[PDB]
Amino acid sequence: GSDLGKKLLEAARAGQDDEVRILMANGADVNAFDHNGSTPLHLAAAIGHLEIVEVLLKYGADVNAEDNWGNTPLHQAAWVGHLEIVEVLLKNGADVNAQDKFGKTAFDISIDNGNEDLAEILQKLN
Amino acid sequence: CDPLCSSGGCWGPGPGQCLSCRNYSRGGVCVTHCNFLNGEPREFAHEAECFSCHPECQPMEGTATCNGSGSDTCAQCAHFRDGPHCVSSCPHGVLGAKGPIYKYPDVQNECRPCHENCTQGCKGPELQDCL
């Protein structure tokens, strides 16, 4: 599953949905991580591929995995304003109050970025 | 004993049942050689064991494809390069030390920085190249 996991990281990085599905069905390590500690779920959350995020969580991706800086995929999705991905990560057990290296939560990030739609979702969902 | 076992003998008939190998092994199975110049996955060797090259290394003809396991040890990237690493795609807001990193690929498929004011992606280095 390790060679497949390396491929999975690059398919999630490029937003290759069909490729991620084939790789998961073949037993790829869902919690593999690249040169930055980003897991496939961090890479999927960054580009905004909601279907890849859902497939990775179905195959057991760690919703609270941290990259080299302590960022979870909730931090990743909130920084780039991917609301739908934020809602799915939360439904699948993401710690809404997880803090980054500056002590900031997904809510703090949304306020820092002026994303009122994101801030409101975080308030309503928790 | 399979011809690929060392003089020490074997516990079974096949190449996966030697006490030790004559030279190379892949996953504990004795092989004639690693996939250095042909075959998939392309490989490098470390202490007579065969290990896979990173999938983003371009398979090379006649010469080695990598000298290590990382995407920073390829002879040539198959798609794009971000710093020392061969990648399928340039950063699309992936978090780094100071927040999301966005890059665009140049003519030579090298990932280059987006302007600091491109809150989303970019197709070039200028502020007018945002999105």
Author numbering:
A (entry chain A): 11 to 136
B (entry chain B): 481 to 611
Q: Anything the authors wrote about it?
A:
Here, the selection of DARPins targeting extracellular domain 4 of HER3 (HER3d4) is described. The DARPin D5 epitope comprises HER3d4 residues 568–577.
One of the selected DARPins, D5, in complex with HER3d4 crystallized in two closely related crystal forms that diffracted to 2.3 and 2.0 Å resolution, respectively. The data processing suggested two different indexing solutions: either space group P21, with unit-cell parmeters a = 64.87, b = 62.25, c = 74.54 Å, β = 102.41°, or space group P212121, with unit-cell parmeters a = 62.26, b = 64.95, c = 144.90 Å. In the orthorhombic setting two complexes are related by the translational NCS vector (0.00, 0.76, 0.50). In fact, the diffraction data from the orthorhombic crystals can be processed in the monoclinic space group, albeit with significantly impaired merging statistics (R meas and R p.i.m. of 14.5% and 5.9%, respectively, in the monoclinic setting, compared with 7.8% and 2.3% in the orthorhombic setting for low-resolution data up to approximately 6 Å). Indeed, superposition of NCS-related chains within each of the crystal forms P21 and P212121 revealed root-mean-square deviations (r.m.s.d.s) for all atoms of 0.164 Å (1554 atoms) and 0.304 Å (1657 atoms), respectively. The L86Q framework mutation positions the hydrophilic Gln86 side chain between the Val574 and Leu575 side chains, where it forms hydrogen bonds to the HER3d4 main-chain atoms Gly573 O and Leu575 N, thus explaining its selection.
